[PDB]
Amino acid sequence: TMDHLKHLQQLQNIERIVLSGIVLANHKIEEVHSVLEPSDFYYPPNGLFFEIALKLHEEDCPIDENFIRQKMPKDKQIKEEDLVAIFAASPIDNIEAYVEEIKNASIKRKLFGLANTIREQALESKSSDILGAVEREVYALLNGSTIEGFRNIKEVLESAMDLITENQRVTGIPTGFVQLDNYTSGFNKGSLVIIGARPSMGKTSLMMNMVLSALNDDRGVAVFSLEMSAEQLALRALSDLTSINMHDLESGRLDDDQWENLAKCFDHLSQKKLFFYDKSYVRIEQIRLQLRKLKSQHKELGIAFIDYLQLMQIAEISRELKTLARELEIPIIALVQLNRSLENRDDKRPILSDIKGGIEQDADIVLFLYRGYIYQMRAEDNKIDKLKKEEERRIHKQNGSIEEAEIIVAKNRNGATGTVYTRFNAPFTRYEDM
Amino acid sequence: MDHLKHLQQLQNIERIVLSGIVLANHKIEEVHSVLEPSDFYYPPNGLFFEIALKLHEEDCPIDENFIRQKMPKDKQIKEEDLVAIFAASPIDNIEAYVEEIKNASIKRKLFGLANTIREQALESKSSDILGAVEREVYALLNGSTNIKEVLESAMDLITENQRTGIPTGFVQLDNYTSGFNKGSLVIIGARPSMGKTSLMMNMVLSALNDDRGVAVFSLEMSAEQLALRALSDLTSINMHDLESGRLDDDQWENLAKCFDHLSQKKLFFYDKSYVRIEQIRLQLRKLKSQHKELGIAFIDYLQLMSGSKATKERQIAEISRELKTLARELEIPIIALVQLNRSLENRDDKRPILSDIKDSGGIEQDADIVLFLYRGYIYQMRAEEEAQELYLKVNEERRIHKQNGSIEEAEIIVAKNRNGATGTVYTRFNAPFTRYEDMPIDSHL
């Protein structure tokens, strides 16, 4: 019921297609030639056709029925049935895969030839010689494939320079804090960045502002909330846009002037490139897969965020995440909730090693949230307890509810290590820039 | 011959869908999200579908060629069907058609199940048959069940407040909890003999007075006793008097008066030992199906076992997950009691913390709200010239406390509150009745 080579006549069609696509798009010939060669073709008229195409492109001459019929080599003549059939073919875009597949077919051809060859070669024997022949054939095929190969650096260097000079004519994605961007130099692509903060310090609120920092830069963001639901996460961001306190927004009552700015920021964010996934306690591979999926769906995606990571090993999580960071070529930011052993210490300032099956290392940039007032309060309480054994808030509210906060830049790979002071607003749970 | 009419139509529909995906490569996602290769009646269609998936995953476009070369080379689809697929007239928004084919597949699996159970009766273990019904039911139930997406929920949330939850019983706590919101998983970790079993019942009563059906699951303790505490709190009679049996004219009267009063309330019980998490899920599905009115559930209590051997013999980490699952499933808030590990008292400050709940396979996190019970006096007594000074100063206190009414200061730590506030509430505790008196901040202290 099955006849070999039936697929092959179909395989010819692909060649026809690709050629037609290049007919319509002359520039495509380069990206074709970079992979396929005239000998790589099964059907000869197609291969020689390709040869002619190359000879024409090198002299910067367009490719068409007129240009093709005239520049005939007069050594071999394309059959009329085929000649017309090529141009008659329906034009198709995204032919890159077709090129790859024709390369597959040619590869298969090299396979059938070599496979038969080596056997007969081995038949005669010096079997060691046959082994060496196998090795040489192996190297030949290996070089032939060019799948996940090496070379070459010098080419990509020029483009990497032409990209930075174009912006020189910001290096990465804007953070939101100018203080921080002096050290970070913006969010560079494929860079794994992590923020470890204690609960209720305003971690969840702080993240959203940096999200907005990317949104005004029109860069696609994928958001991952495991523990929390999406709705609230949106609510904080609106709390930061409309400049309205959290409670009034949460309860429901809004006057004439606030619902207006609310609705004004509403569609503003609605049109912004924003995606959500509120499903609880997702696995790392599922993350990799879904990110592959969304990046496949949307090219525009330039950054990713996750809130937040749970303690169970952290090293492999950070590793696969760095892997995906360089894979999708975008900087990934995840939130971590540090261990309680941080507060047992006298100086309650967060340090790199506080989140202890091993300690996390893979992160390129690590940021800590520290509120100078919250730990001052406990020391004052301790001193009071010490005095028994031996109003300030309302003033704070009347000032404008501004407290001193520090964003520790403890880790910066091949950069600077420092601390930046930022004013924190308690009711809006927002970090003011200055 | 209506069956084969449906058959001849379904072949057509499958083909249609396949062709539509041929022209629109991207639709494969929403198809796979619903349908699977086995879901197809006509085998070549399923095979075709499988191949399509394999092509999409390597991000390769879909057409006549891509399929023909990338044949599984285990089986080759007959040409007659293959071409007929392409020949099919493309129609948009086939989501309804997809739904219809899913319908057909559903039916297909159903008939098999029906036959299975039919033949099962020949044996004549009916309990086994019951279990088979339950498992098949679970199978069918499980089989059945971006910005614009979140916008709609954002509307459905505010419309709900315009249209908050189940009352706790304590206004202090309700200031933080904002009542028991539906589908929200709430956990309580308390030390033994603190009056945990006694405390739960008050909140049970708070929901019963809200006329919402409450389901109770007691593994460790018996139902009868659990009711006895509730009557101890209703009739305001000491536990021992109610337990021993002797009651005077005024106590048996108020007793009988509260008896039928509670007897008519929507209350359900399960005192069976060592129920499994899945067994819980099933039983709650059964009771919610039996009674729509039930809005809340309570459990007392699970013990924590850490390691690895704790996964097969029966983990709370995944158990809490399955419980959150069921919480959102029946859309009602679930409350479970937890007995913390002894390492809590090894610490200098015997105040309970979130990480005290360690398990085999991680620390519990899935819980939305976590509450702690702390009695400031019970650890103080045990913690309790200078020695003589103390000896006469504190001996003074003991007889004094007893005559007052055995009222002690108690703290209910609200350590965890999802999208809310973290704080502590002070309430007066009564030792003999083992009851927590409810009182606001302005009235307290």
mmCIF file of C-alpha atoms in Angstrom, chain A residues 111-424:
data_model
loop_
_atom_site.group_PDB
_atom_site.id
_atom_site.type_symbol
_atom_site.label_atom_id
_atom_site.label_comp_id
_atom_site.label_asym_id
_atom_site.label_seq_id
_atom_site.Cartn_x
_atom_site.Cartn_y
_atom_site.Cartn_z
ATOM 1 C CA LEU A 111 23.796 9.985 4.580
ATOM 2 C CA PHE A 112 22.734 7.414 1.976
ATOM 3 C CA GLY A 113 25.931 7.923 0.019
ATOM 4 C CA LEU A 114 28.363 7.781 2.912
ATOM 5 C CA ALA A 115 26.569 4.956 4.727
ATOM 6 C CA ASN A 116 26.884 2.699 1.726
ATOM 7 C CA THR A 117 30.427 3.948 1.076
ATOM 8 C CA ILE A 118 32.039 3.128 4.440
ATOM 9 C CA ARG A 119 30.624 -0.420 4.524
ATOM 10 C CA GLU A 120 32.267 -1.389 1.250
ATOM 11 C CA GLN A 121 35.398 0.459 2.351
ATOM 12 C CA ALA A 122 35.526 -1.669 5.489
ATOM 13 C CA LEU A 123 34.903 -4.857 3.520
ATOM 14 C CA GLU A 124 38.418 -5.055 2.004
ATOM 15 C CA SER A 125 40.681 -4.822 5.076
ATOM 16 C CA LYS A 126 43.828 -2.805 7.880
ATOM 17 C CA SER A 127 40.613 -2.480 9.903
ATOM 18 C CA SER A 128 42.257 0.275 11.940
ATOM 19 C CA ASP A 129 42.322 2.193 8.660
ATOM 20 C CA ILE A 130 38.573 1.579 8.362
ATOM 21 C CA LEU A 131 38.160 2.977 11.877
ATOM 22 C CA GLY A 132 40.121 6.084 10.909
ATOM 23 C CA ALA A 133 37.880 6.341 7.848
ATOM 24 C CA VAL A 134 34.885 6.280 10.164
ATOM 25 C CA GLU A 135 36.442 9.066 12.237
ATOM 26 C CA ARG A 136 37.157 11.212 9.180
ATOM 27 C CA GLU A 137 33.638 10.647 7.876
ATOM 28 C CA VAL A 138 32.371 11.644 11.316
ATOM 29 C CA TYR A 139 34.299 14.916 11.272
ATOM 30 C CA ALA A 140 33.095 15.513 7.710
ATOM 31 C CA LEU A 141 29.440 15.093 8.644
ATOM 32 C CA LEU A 142 29.908 17.100 11.839
ATOM 33 C CA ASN A 143 31.298 20.064 9.915
ATOM 34 C CA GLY A 144 28.643 19.514 7.236
ATOM 35 C CA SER A 145 25.679 19.808 9.612
ATOM 36 C CA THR A 146 26.338 23.248 11.144
ATOM 37 C CA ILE A 147 23.689 22.584 13.799
ATOM 38 C CA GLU A 148 24.286 24.465 17.065
ATOM 39 C CA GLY A 149 27.806 25.225 15.837
ATOM 40 C CA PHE A 150 30.421 27.683 17.096
ATOM 41 C CA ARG A 151 31.669 30.291 14.628
ATOM 42 C CA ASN A 152 31.844 33.117 14.434
ATOM 43 C CA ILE A 153 32.499 35.838 17.024
ATOM 44 C CA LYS A 154 33.988 38.628 14.862
ATOM 45 C CA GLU A 155 30.777 38.971 12.861
ATOM 46 C CA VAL A 156 28.511 39.351 15.881
ATOM 47 C CA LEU A 157 30.969 41.782 17.476
ATOM 48 C CA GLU A 158 30.355 44.324 14.732
ATOM 49 C CA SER A 159 26.583 44.119 15.177
ATOM 50 C CA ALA A 160 26.905 44.307 18.961
ATOM 51 C CA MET A 161 28.867 47.518 18.472
ATOM 52 C CA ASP A 162 26.430 48.834 15.866
ATOM 53 C CA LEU A 163 23.657 48.347 18.421
ATOM 54 C CA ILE A 164 25.260 50.239 21.312
ATOM 55 C CA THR A 165 26.500 53.041 19.045
ATOM 56 C CA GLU A 166 22.947 53.456 17.736
ATOM 57 C CA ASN A 167 21.754 54.234 21.250
ATOM 58 C CA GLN A 168 24.931 56.265 21.723
ATOM 59 C CA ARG A 169 23.980 58.103 18.533
ATOM 60 C CA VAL A 170 20.427 54.074 28.378
ATOM 61 C CA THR A 171 21.999 50.644 27.917
ATOM 62 C CA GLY A 172 19.163 48.331 28.942
ATOM 63 C CA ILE A 173 15.619 48.462 30.294
ATOM 64 C CA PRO A 174 14.962 51.335 32.726
ATOM 65 C CA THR A 175 14.652 50.337 36.385
ATOM 66 C CA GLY A 176 12.675 53.317 37.642
ATOM 67 C CA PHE A 177 15.253 54.511 40.143
ATOM 68 C CA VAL A 178 18.035 56.718 38.787
ATOM 69 C CA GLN A 179 20.018 55.943 41.943
ATOM 70 C CA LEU A 180 19.948 52.242 41.127
ATOM 71 C CA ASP A 181 20.534 52.628 37.384
ATOM 72 C CA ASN A 182 23.864 54.303 38.143
ATOM 73 C CA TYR A 183 25.064 50.917 39.375
ATOM 74 C CA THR A 184 22.938 48.496 37.361
ATOM 75 C CA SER A 185 23.403 50.423 34.097
ATOM 76 C CA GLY A 186 19.855 49.376 33.259
ATOM 77 C CA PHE A 187 18.544 45.831 32.922
ATOM 78 C CA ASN A 188 20.907 44.146 30.485
ATOM 79 C CA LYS A 189 19.569 41.255 28.400
ATOM 80 C CA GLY A 190 19.939 37.686 29.633
ATOM 81 C CA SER A 191 20.872 38.948 33.077
ATOM 82 C CA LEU A 192 19.361 37.229 36.100
ATOM 83 C CA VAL A 193 18.276 39.744 38.744
ATOM 84 C CA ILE A 194 16.827 38.908 42.173
ATOM 85 C CA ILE A 195 15.253 40.946 45.001
ATOM 86 C CA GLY A 196 15.005 39.466 48.500
ATOM 87 C CA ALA A 197 12.646 41.295 50.852
ATOM 88 C CA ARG A 198 10.863 40.612 54.151
ATOM 89 C CA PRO A 199 7.034 40.441 54.055
ATOM 90 C CA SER A 200 4.812 43.542 54.313
ATOM 91 C CA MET A 201 7.883 45.726 53.676
ATOM 92 C CA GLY A 202 6.138 46.710 50.458
ATOM 93 C CA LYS A 203 7.767 44.155 48.178
ATOM 94 C CA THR A 204 4.621 43.453 46.165
ATOM 95 C CA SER A 205 3.936 47.170 45.800
ATOM 96 C CA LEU A 206 7.550 48.005 44.918
ATOM 97 C CA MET A 207 7.646 45.476 42.071
ATOM 98 C CA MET A 208 4.716 47.082 40.233
ATOM 99 C CA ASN A 209 6.451 50.450 39.900
ATOM 100 C CA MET A 210 9.424 48.844 38.183
ATOM 101 C CA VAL A 211 6.907 47.046 35.978
ATOM 102 C CA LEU A 212 5.488 50.446 35.012
ATOM 103 C CA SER A 213 9.044 51.640 34.342
ATOM 104 C CA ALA A 214 9.199 49.037 31.592
ATOM 105 C CA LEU A 215 5.659 49.755 30.388
ATOM 106 C CA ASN A 216 6.432 53.403 29.607
ATOM 107 C CA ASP A 217 9.397 52.002 27.672
ATOM 108 C CA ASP A 218 6.815 49.961 25.699
ATOM 109 C CA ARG A 219 8.429 46.612 26.522
ATOM 110 C CA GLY A 220 6.407 43.406 26.852
ATOM 111 C CA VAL A 221 6.229 42.042 30.391
ATOM 112 C CA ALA A 222 5.149 38.570 31.539
ATOM 113 C CA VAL A 223 3.956 38.473 35.155
ATOM 114 C CA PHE A 224 3.957 35.430 37.441
ATOM 115 C CA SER A 225 2.157 35.411 40.784
ATOM 116 C CA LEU A 226 2.183 32.038 42.534
ATOM 117 C CA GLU A 227 1.129 32.915 46.071
ATOM 118 C CA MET A 228 -1.027 35.952 45.285
ATOM 119 C CA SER A 229 -3.846 36.601 42.808
ATOM 120 C CA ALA A 230 -3.525 38.959 39.818
ATOM 121 C CA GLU A 231 -6.332 41.367 40.726
ATOM 122 C CA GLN A 232 -4.665 42.759 43.848
ATOM 123 C CA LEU A 233 -1.375 43.127 42.003
ATOM 124 C CA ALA A 234 -3.182 45.325 39.490
ATOM 125 C CA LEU A 235 -4.835 47.253 42.318
ATOM 126 C CA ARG A 236 -1.482 48.303 43.808
ATOM 127 C CA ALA A 237 -0.294 49.572 40.434
ATOM 128 C CA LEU A 238 -3.433 51.672 40.097
ATOM 129 C CA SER A 239 -2.785 52.851 43.657
ATOM 130 C CA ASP A 240 0.528 54.147 42.348
ATOM 131 C CA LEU A 241 -0.841 55.665 39.112
ATOM 132 C CA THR A 242 -3.923 57.474 40.386
ATOM 133 C CA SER A 243 -1.954 58.420 43.500
ATOM 134 C CA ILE A 244 -4.748 57.101 45.703
ATOM 135 C CA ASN A 245 -4.395 55.310 49.051
ATOM 136 C CA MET A 246 -4.906 51.536 49.067
ATOM 137 C CA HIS A 247 -7.932 51.337 51.380
ATOM 138 C CA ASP A 248 -10.243 53.715 49.512
ATOM 139 C CA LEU A 249 -9.492 51.818 46.308
ATOM 140 C CA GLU A 250 -10.157 48.485 48.009
ATOM 141 C CA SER A 251 -13.389 49.337 49.854
ATOM 142 C CA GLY A 252 -15.373 50.663 46.889
ATOM 143 C CA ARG A 253 -16.353 54.257 47.680
ATOM 144 C CA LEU A 254 -15.014 56.871 45.265
ATOM 145 C CA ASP A 255 -15.965 60.522 44.873
ATOM 146 C CA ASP A 256 -16.332 62.467 41.627
ATOM 147 C CA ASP A 257 -12.649 63.421 41.342
ATOM 148 C CA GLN A 258 -10.990 60.066 42.103
ATOM 149 C CA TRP A 259 -13.068 57.700 39.959
ATOM 150 C CA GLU A 260 -12.218 60.017 37.063
ATOM 151 C CA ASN A 261 -8.434 59.674 37.363
ATOM 152 C CA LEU A 262 -9.075 55.994 38.039
ATOM 153 C CA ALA A 263 -10.920 55.517 34.764
ATOM 154 C CA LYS A 264 -8.270 57.682 33.094
ATOM 155 C CA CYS A 265 -5.495 55.294 34.116
ATOM 156 C CA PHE A 266 -7.750 52.303 33.433
ATOM 157 C CA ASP A 267 -7.724 52.089 29.634
ATOM 158 C CA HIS A 268 -4.245 53.605 29.663
ATOM 159 C CA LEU A 269 -3.065 50.406 31.305
ATOM 160 C CA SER A 270 -5.598 48.319 29.352
ATOM 161 C CA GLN A 271 -3.864 49.139 26.076
ATOM 162 C CA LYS A 272 -0.425 48.529 27.589
ATOM 163 C CA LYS A 273 1.211 45.183 26.777
ATOM 164 C CA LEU A 274 0.368 43.238 29.954
ATOM 165 C CA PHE A 275 -0.077 39.508 30.683
ATOM 166 C CA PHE A 276 -1.094 37.544 33.795
ATOM 167 C CA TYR A 277 -0.938 34.050 35.305
ATOM 168 C CA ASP A 278 -2.414 33.660 38.795
ATOM 169 C CA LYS A 279 -2.167 29.865 39.078
ATOM 170 C CA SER A 280 -0.611 28.701 42.360
ATOM 171 C CA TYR A 281 2.727 26.953 42.979
ATOM 172 C CA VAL A 282 3.894 26.331 39.396
ATOM 173 C CA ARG A 283 6.961 24.145 38.660
ATOM 174 C CA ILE A 284 10.179 25.528 37.119
ATOM 175 C CA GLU A 285 9.913 23.563 33.858
ATOM 176 C CA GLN A 286 6.333 24.707 33.425
ATOM 177 C CA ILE A 287 7.725 28.234 33.743
ATOM 178 C CA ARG A 288 10.332 27.567 31.047
ATOM 179 C CA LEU A 289 7.671 26.088 28.760
ATOM 180 C CA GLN A 290 5.085 28.829 29.268
ATOM 181 C CA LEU A 291 7.725 31.494 28.723
ATOM 182 C CA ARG A 292 8.727 29.723 25.499
ATOM 183 C CA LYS A 293 5.048 29.736 24.556
ATOM 184 C CA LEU A 294 4.397 33.401 25.258
ATOM 185 C CA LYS A 295 7.637 34.544 23.663
ATOM 186 C CA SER A 296 6.606 32.488 20.636
ATOM 187 C CA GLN A 297 3.218 34.216 20.752
ATOM 188 C CA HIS A 298 4.664 37.670 21.374
ATOM 189 C CA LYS A 299 8.054 38.866 20.115
ATOM 190 C CA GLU A 300 7.660 42.196 21.908
ATOM 191 C CA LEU A 301 8.334 40.586 25.306
ATOM 192 C CA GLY A 302 11.530 42.094 26.701
ATOM 193 C CA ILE A 303 11.344 41.396 30.434
ATOM 194 C CA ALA A 304 9.847 39.002 33.008
ATOM 195 C CA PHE A 305 8.856 39.099 36.689
ATOM 196 C CA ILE A 306 7.941 36.448 39.287
ATOM 197 C CA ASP A 307 6.469 36.822 42.799
ATOM 198 C CA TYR A 308 7.504 34.969 44.675
ATOM 199 C CA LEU A 309 9.892 32.100 45.382
ATOM 200 C CA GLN A 310 9.196 29.509 48.049
ATOM 201 C CA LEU A 311 11.673 27.584 50.225
ATOM 202 C CA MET A 312 11.865 23.801 49.873
ATOM 203 C CA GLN A 313 16.875 23.418 45.917
ATOM 204 C CA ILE A 314 17.364 27.126 45.205
ATOM 205 C CA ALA A 315 20.628 26.684 43.276
ATOM 206 C CA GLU A 316 19.047 24.687 40.458
ATOM 207 C CA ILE A 317 16.046 27.016 40.295
ATOM 208 C CA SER A 318 18.392 29.967 39.879
ATOM 209 C CA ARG A 319 20.401 27.954 37.359
ATOM 210 C CA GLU A 320 17.559 27.009 35.030
ATOM 211 C CA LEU A 321 16.299 30.570 35.386
ATOM 212 C CA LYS A 322 19.662 31.989 34.283
ATOM 213 C CA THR A 323 19.530 29.421 31.479
ATOM 214 C CA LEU A 324 16.165 30.737 30.336
ATOM 215 C CA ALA A 325 17.403 34.294 30.878
ATOM 216 C CA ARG A 326 20.108 33.889 28.258
ATOM 217 C CA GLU A 327 17.858 31.626 26.195
ATOM 218 C CA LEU A 328 15.069 34.163 25.725
ATOM 219 C CA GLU A 329 17.711 36.898 25.869
ATOM 220 C CA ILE A 330 15.774 38.916 28.444
ATOM 221 C CA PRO A 331 16.560 39.928 32.039
ATOM 222 C CA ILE A 332 14.413 38.034 34.551
ATOM 223 C CA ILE A 333 13.458 39.370 37.983
ATOM 224 C CA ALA A 334 12.180 37.160 40.818
ATOM 225 C CA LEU A 335 11.182 37.958 44.402
ATOM 226 C CA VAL A 336 12.490 35.920 47.343
ATOM 227 C CA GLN A 337 11.284 35.901 50.951
ATOM 228 C CA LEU A 338 14.335 35.621 53.220
ATOM 229 C CA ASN A 339 14.649 33.345 56.254
ATOM 230 C CA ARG A 340 13.763 34.565 59.745
ATOM 231 C CA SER A 341 17.371 34.108 60.895
ATOM 232 C CA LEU A 342 17.955 37.617 59.515
ATOM 233 C CA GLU A 343 16.239 39.248 62.488
ATOM 234 C CA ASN A 344 18.068 37.165 65.104
ATOM 235 C CA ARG A 345 21.113 39.251 64.183
ATOM 236 C CA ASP A 346 21.979 42.525 65.933
ATOM 237 C CA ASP A 347 22.311 44.572 62.744
ATOM 238 C CA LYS A 348 19.008 43.828 61.031
ATOM 239 C CA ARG A 349 20.385 44.942 57.660
ATOM 240 C CA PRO A 350 19.889 42.268 54.959
ATOM 241 C CA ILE A 351 22.997 40.477 53.694
ATOM 242 C CA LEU A 352 23.648 38.246 50.676
ATOM 243 C CA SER A 353 23.847 34.991 52.654
ATOM 244 C CA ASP A 354 20.659 35.324 54.740
ATOM 245 C CA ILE A 355 18.456 33.003 52.653
ATOM 246 C CA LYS A 356 19.832 29.621 53.749
ATOM 247 C CA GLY A 357 20.356 22.425 50.516
ATOM 248 C CA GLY A 358 22.835 25.175 49.695
ATOM 249 C CA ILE A 359 22.980 28.925 49.097
ATOM 250 C CA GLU A 360 21.784 30.669 45.903
ATOM 251 C CA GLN A 361 24.609 31.936 43.670
ATOM 252 C CA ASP A 362 23.413 32.166 40.041
ATOM 253 C CA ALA A 363 21.874 35.641 40.395
ATOM 254 C CA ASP A 364 23.810 38.397 38.618
ATOM 255 C CA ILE A 365 22.299 41.337 40.517
ATOM 256 C CA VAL A 366 20.848 41.124 44.047
ATOM 257 C CA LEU A 367 18.777 43.855 45.725
ATOM 258 C CA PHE A 368 17.664 44.162 49.361
ATOM 259 C CA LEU A 369 14.835 46.217 50.876
ATOM 260 C CA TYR A 370 15.624 47.828 54.229
ATOM 261 C CA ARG A 371 13.379 50.190 56.192
ATOM 262 C CA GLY A 372 15.403 52.210 58.692
ATOM 263 C CA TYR A 373 12.435 53.203 60.844
ATOM 264 C CA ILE A 374 10.888 49.760 61.404
ATOM 265 C CA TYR A 375 14.010 48.446 63.180
ATOM 266 C CA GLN A 376 14.606 51.714 65.041
ATOM 267 C CA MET A 377 11.176 51.239 66.587
ATOM 268 C CA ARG A 378 12.077 47.835 68.028
ATOM 269 C CA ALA A 379 15.301 49.196 69.508
ATOM 270 C CA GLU A 380 13.325 52.003 71.131
ATOM 271 C CA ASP A 381 10.896 49.421 72.527
ATOM 272 C CA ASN A 382 13.809 47.380 73.896
ATOM 273 C CA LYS A 383 15.241 50.511 75.505
ATOM 274 C CA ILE A 384 11.862 51.274 77.102
ATOM 275 C CA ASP A 385 11.711 47.723 78.481
ATOM 276 C CA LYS A 386 15.239 48.346 79.746
ATOM 277 C CA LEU A 387 14.133 51.546 81.497
ATOM 278 C CA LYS A 388 11.175 49.901 83.230
ATOM 279 C CA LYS A 389 13.804 47.478 84.515
ATOM 280 C CA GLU A 390 16.246 50.294 85.344
ATOM 281 C CA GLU A 391 2.331 60.657 69.048
ATOM 282 C CA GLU A 392 5.331 60.247 66.749
ATOM 283 C CA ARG A 393 3.096 58.505 64.211
ATOM 284 C CA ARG A 394 0.611 61.379 63.948
ATOM 285 C CA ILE A 395 3.498 63.779 63.395
ATOM 286 C CA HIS A 396 4.707 61.410 60.664
ATOM 287 C CA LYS A 397 1.244 61.476 59.074
ATOM 288 C CA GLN A 398 1.166 65.276 59.261
ATOM 289 C CA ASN A 399 4.591 65.588 57.607
ATOM 290 C CA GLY A 400 3.313 63.729 54.553
ATOM 291 C CA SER A 401 3.921 60.158 55.730
ATOM 292 C CA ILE A 402 7.473 60.021 54.349
ATOM 293 C CA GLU A 403 10.022 57.678 55.980
ATOM 294 C CA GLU A 404 13.662 56.908 55.139
ATOM 295 C CA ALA A 405 14.216 53.672 53.199
ATOM 296 C CA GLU A 406 17.354 51.994 51.824
ATOM 297 C CA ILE A 407 17.614 49.815 48.720
ATOM 298 C CA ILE A 408 20.830 47.851 49.235
ATOM 299 C CA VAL A 409 22.710 47.058 46.025
ATOM 300 C CA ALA A 410 24.777 44.253 47.543
ATOM 301 C CA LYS A 411 25.474 42.345 44.331
ATOM 302 C CA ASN A 412 26.351 43.700 40.897
ATOM 303 C CA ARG A 413 28.337 41.412 38.602
ATOM 304 C CA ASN A 414 31.299 43.311 37.171
ATOM 305 C CA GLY A 415 29.860 46.578 38.463
ATOM 306 C CA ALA A 416 29.586 48.630 41.642
ATOM 307 C CA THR A 417 28.430 47.630 45.131
ATOM 308 C CA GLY A 418 26.596 50.242 47.177
ATOM 309 C CA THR A 419 23.522 51.511 48.993
ATOM 310 C CA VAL A 420 20.927 53.993 47.755
ATOM 311 C CA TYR A 421 18.617 56.055 49.958
ATOM 312 C CA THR A 422 15.027 56.509 48.817
ATOM 313 C CA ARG A 423 12.011 58.110 50.464
ATOM 314 C CA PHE A 424 9.211 55.651 51.190
#
